[PDB]
């Protein structure tokens, strides 16, 4: 399940796409089964806003259209079981 | 585990559905399923366009069903 | 079954609204609620998308379509502080 | 055994010898990347993808006056939840 | 007297065109279908409003999106 | 009846696992190569694990 | 001149092919890859895959100068490819 | 993680924009949640405006939203004394 | 006392016609005769026929199977 | 030396000037090496963001000497071209032409051939919007330039290259340059109009040969 | 693996070993491209793999000959130990750039050192190296495409 890939995440500092268009960077903490993503640092910019600082942010994992993931990972040594 | 709605209030009811894309029905309640599709006897359709298309017997998935207003006193 | 559902499960037979999928909100006294959130609704007003209003004296509403519930502060404090 | 005949055959046709798709999203972003995994849900981590959407100036003008243009955005490493999939499509 | 999994048991292989619910179409021979009924086309050529935009080649076409499917 | 003849009561499986090639996943990963060490090692002559 | 056409995926397709982003044995298919990696995933040239190799083999790695020439190439690799125009415009003030 | 924000002051954001802030007393496996305290915004929401912070306001008091409607969360302020 | 499925039950048999209206697609209908389905509700049906209400057209499709979680209605 | 990026319309234009070679006592041998080191130190000037990586010659023999000089950046591909492309029409626009003539300094004069056209219609289009102007210049001068303002009315600015004009004025001034170039073709080139199909329209407008 | 393994020319070792969790039913010593094979009715458990490299001249560049000859004498023999009789010798030949093994193979072991050989002497860095180092010690390129 591809999902358990992503609780072995914590700590990057990702942006995620919305179904909303609502791009929110920010270092993630937290994901559930269900892709229930808890942020920290959250610099999220609701699509036809500007973007607002917040201190912490809990996407519903439904809500998730796509991550952006940096440079800098590891997944040949991630998506290992 | 997915337990029936709880509709034997509204059996053999005069019933206005409400569907999904701005759309309305009208009918006799004849029986549902625990997805609470309906099975309607008497059904007219009642589109927008303010004309009343009587059909009889018609089944209704659940998913589209917004709500249902017991035009009958139950 | 979890405590927003026992919740509800606590405001049967109270005053309780429902905004819906479409936008309409339904404010009246409940009768019956259950697990997958169907509310069967009394003495109720319909308010569209319009802004009219209606009346009448029963409604039953689909669980998934409703987007939210407006409660009474009855229930605000017994007894889910423990939570 | 059936992983490698069902119709998720082409993303793990494609995830074995590391070819690109093109992927229909379903806000109509077209994702063309090489697919890292997948799953059951199309949960496809992708590498080096182009984001390739339209878009118009939207009244640049104030008489609604324009030509849709073809935009493009990399990203290196992402994770595509797999319900905004729409279709997946092995190469020619 | 034919249940949906034996119709698309029936038409693996020949060419059909199955129509999403956003109103575009796929035209070719379909490979296979899973359970939840996820489609892989091969030779497929994509029908646009009934107007075809392109030859592709093999897609998978997922199962939350198809509208139905039609044997041509 | 032919309701249990079409082998009634509409299905939905959600939770429970589905029949078959549904679950396919598949992974692409290749790990660093970990080679041997023979130059200026200190340690005895054949190699370690 | 191809738009990517709302309602239409070929569209996409014919932009990015314009734009040219494309004993009794048992009796089967080993799909062999033998692929040199770092452990960023990348896909190793045979020159630094035999270098990673080297440096293993030989138990000493580069020095210090060598290791910050070779980062800060990989990220102007990364910062080149994640991408004045705009500010010649805008100096063109006069 | 969210059991390390219970009874605190959320902004949860809906699908449609409908923007909620309240007590966040209690959610469930589906986040459908519980919310005491909380008002509702849909155009203008409060970063020190230069005209007023806070129009575009409605009281509903307690909701039960549904899980299947909502995006996000953030906490606005500390939880207040009752 | 019927059911939904003891409702196609009883129209598949009797193999009359039917028309099927969808999910938010209020324009769009598919007429047709239903040959078989089971308890996802996806329908095969019979020479089946897409009539668009607002001009009234009637593109013919043949045998047709659509998928279950997309209809509203079937009316008879 | 022009220095057409296709994607960016950044035209770096080097002024060559004249006592480079009027008293230079050599032959091509320092030619080809001399606008390759100096294109080559146009790359050496700029960052690694803004360096390229694929360079396409329009004149064959410049590859070759490219290919030396750029063995500092090996990351770079150095490709020819088979469609030749009329930068001469460049120098033939007043502008650029007194621009190159009077400067007595060589200097690394920019450029951005495509004016402000990146904010309203593709990087694709306004490249063969700029080829068709270019190559409609070069069949001829004057009846391009009097084609190139629809109106006596309009004005392009200074700091612009092309006169400012929207979408409709555009598409019916690309469709008068465009047949204007075929019927230039099709008078020299002994062959009507009319028997040509759009790849064809296509690779005469590029500068192929069919 | 002896750090001076690699060019022990007159003894061997072995360099990989297959535990098989299991017993393979193994065949006789088969040379890498003979594809009718018959079973040698012995069953084994560990699995040694040697990799025998040469620098062939022109009169004994065989790599199938040397390594026959090479399995043949190193499993015979005495200043040689081998966890299991059973097991393949793979010599490649670097002046000629040519690979065989010969020892015994288990069920897919065939088509596996096959198709692996091949894309070992087309893709091996160190191999990659020493081509380019022979290649610039001759001073002799390719056209560049």
């Known amino acids: 399940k591809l999902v358990r890939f992503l609780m072995k995440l914590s700590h990057e500092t990702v942006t995620i796409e919305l179904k909303n268009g609502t791009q929110v960077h920010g270092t993630i903490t937290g994901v559930d089964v269900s892709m229930n993503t808890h942020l920290k640092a959250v610099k999220m910019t609701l699509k036809n806003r500007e973007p607002v600082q917040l201190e912490t942010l809990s996407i519903r994992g439904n809500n998730i259209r796509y991550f952006i993931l940096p440079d800098s990972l590891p997944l040949d040594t991630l998506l290992v079981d | 585990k997915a337990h029936p709605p709880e509709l034997k209030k509204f059996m053999d009811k005069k019933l206005s559905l409400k569907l999904n894309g701005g759309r309305h029905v009208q009918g006799i309640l004849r029986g549902f399923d625990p997805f609470m599709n309906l099975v309607i006897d008497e059904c007219v359709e009642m589109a927008t366009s303010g004309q009343q298309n009587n059909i009889g017997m018609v089944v209704i998935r659940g998913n589209s069903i917004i709500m249902l207003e017991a035009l009958e006193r139950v | 079954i979890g405590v927003p559902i026992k919740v509800l499960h606590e405001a049967e037979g109270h005053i309780v609204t429902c905004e819906t999928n479409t936008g309409e909100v339904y404010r009246g006294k409940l009768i019956e609620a259950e697990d997958n959130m169907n509310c069967q609704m009394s003495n109720i007003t319909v308010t569209y998308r319009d802004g009219r209003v209606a009346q009448l004296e029963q409604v039953y509403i689909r669980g998934s379509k409703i987007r939210f519930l407006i409660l009474p502060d009855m229930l605000k404090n017994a007894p889910m502080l423990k939570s | 055994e059936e992983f490698n005949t069902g119709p998720l055959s082409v993303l793990t046709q494609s995830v074995k010898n590391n070819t690109q798709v093109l992927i229909n999203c379903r806000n109509n972003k077209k994702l063309l990347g090489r697919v890292k995994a997948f799953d059951r849900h199309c949960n496809m981590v992708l590498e080096n993808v182009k984001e390739m959407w339209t878009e118009v100036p939207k009244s640049g003008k104030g008489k609604k006056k324009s030509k849709p243009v073809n935009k493009d955005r990399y990203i290196s490493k992402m994770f595509l939840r797999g319900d905004s999939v729409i279709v997946v499509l092995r190469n020619p | 007297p034919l249940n949906p999994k034996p119709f698309l048991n029936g038409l693996t292989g020949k060419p059909v065109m199955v129509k999403l619910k956003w109103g575009m179409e796929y035209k070719g021979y379909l490979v296979s279908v899973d359970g939840y009924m996820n489609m892989q086309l091969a030779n497929t050529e994509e029908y646009i409003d009934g107007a075809l935009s392109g030859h592709l080649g093999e897609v998978l076409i997922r199962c939350n999106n198809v509208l139905y499917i039609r044997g041509v | ?49 | 001149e191809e738009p990517i056409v709302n309602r239409g995926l070929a569209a996409a397709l014919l932009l990015c092919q314009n734009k040219g982003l494309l004993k009794e044995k048992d009796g089967y298919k080993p799909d062999v890859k033998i692929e040199y990696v770092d452990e960023t995933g990348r896909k190793l040239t045979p020159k630094e895959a035999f270098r990673q190799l080297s440096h293993r083999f030989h138990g000493k790695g580069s020095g210090k100068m060598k290791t910050e020439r070779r980062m800060k190439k990989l990220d102007e690799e990364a910062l080149l490819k994640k991408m004045l125009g705009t500010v010649a415009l805008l100096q063109e003030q006069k | 993680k969210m059991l390390q924000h219970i009874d605190y002051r959320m902004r949860c954001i809906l699908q449609d924009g409908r923007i909620f802030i309240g007590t966040f007393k209690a959610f469930d496996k589906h986040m459908n949640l519980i919310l005491c305290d909380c008002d509702e915004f849909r155009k203008i929401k409060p970063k020190n405006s230069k005209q007023a912070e806070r129009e575009e306001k409605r009281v509903l008091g307690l909701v039960l939203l549904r899980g299947e409607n909502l995006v996000s969360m953030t906490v606005e302020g500390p939880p207040p004394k009752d | 006392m019927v059911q939904p499925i003891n409702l196609i039950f009883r129209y598949l048999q009797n193999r009359s016609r039917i028309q099927v209206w969808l999910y938010e697609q209020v324009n769009m209908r598919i007429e047709g005769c239903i040959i078989g389905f089971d308890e996802y509700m996806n329908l095969v049906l019979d020479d089946a026929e897409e009539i668009h209400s607002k001009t009234k057209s009637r593109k013919q499709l043949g045998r047709i199977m659509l998928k279950g979680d997309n209809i509203t209605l079937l009316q008879s | 030396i022009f220095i057409f990026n296709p994607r960016t319309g950044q035209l770096f234009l080097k002024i060559i000037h004249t006592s480079v070679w009027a008293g230079q006592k050599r032959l091509g041998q320092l030619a080809k090496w001399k606008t390759a080191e100096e294109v080559a130190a146009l790359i050496r000037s700029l960052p690694v963001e803004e360096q390229p990586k694929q360079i396409i010659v329009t004149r064959k023999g410049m590859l070759d000497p490219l290919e030396v000089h750029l063995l500092d950046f090996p990351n770079i591909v150095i490709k020819g071209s088979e469609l030749q492309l009329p930068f001469q029409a460049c120098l033939k626009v007043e502008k650029f032409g007194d621009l190159i003539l009077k400067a007595t300094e060589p200097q690394m004069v920019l450029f951005n051939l495509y004016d402000d056209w990146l904010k309203t219609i593709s990087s694709y289009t306004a490249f063969s919007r700029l080829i068709l102007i270019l190559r409609a210049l070069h069949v001829n001068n004057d009846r391009a330039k009097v084609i190139l303002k629809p109106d006596k009315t309009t004005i392009t600015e200074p700091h612009h290259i092309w006169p400012t004009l929207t979408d409709e004025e555009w598409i019916k001034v690309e469709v008068q340059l465009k047949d204007l170039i075929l019927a230039d073709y099709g008078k020299k080139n002994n062959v009507n109009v009319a028997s040509l199909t759009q790849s064809e329209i296509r690779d005469i407008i590029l500068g192929m040969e069919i | 693996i002896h750090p001076r393994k690699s060019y022990k020319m007159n003894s061997s070792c072995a360099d990989i070993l297959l535990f098989a969790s299991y017993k393979w039913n193994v065949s006789r010593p088969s040379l890498l491209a003979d594809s009718k094979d018959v079973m040698d009715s012995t069953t084994t458990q560990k699995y040694w793999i040697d990799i025998q490299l040469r620098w062939g001249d022109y009169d004994s560049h065989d790599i199938e000959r040397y390594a026959r000859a090479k399995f043949l004498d190193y499993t015979t023999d005495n200043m040689s130990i081998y966890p299991s009789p059973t097991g393949v010798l793979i010599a490649i030949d670097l002046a000629y750039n040519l690979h065989s093994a010969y020892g015994n193979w288990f069920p897919g072991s065939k088509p596996l050192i096959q198709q692996a050989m091949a894309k070992i002497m087309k893709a091996n860095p160190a191999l990659y190296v020493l081509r380019e180092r022979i290649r610039k010690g001759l001073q002799l390129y390719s056209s560049e495409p």
């Open chain 6, 1 to 49: 009846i032919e309701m249990m003849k079409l082998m009634a009561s509409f299905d939905s499986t959600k939770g429970k696992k589905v029949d078959g090639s549904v679950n396919a996943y598949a992974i692409n990963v290749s790990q660093k190569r970990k080679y041997r060490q023979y130059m200026n090692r200190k340690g005895g002559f054949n190699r370690p694990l």
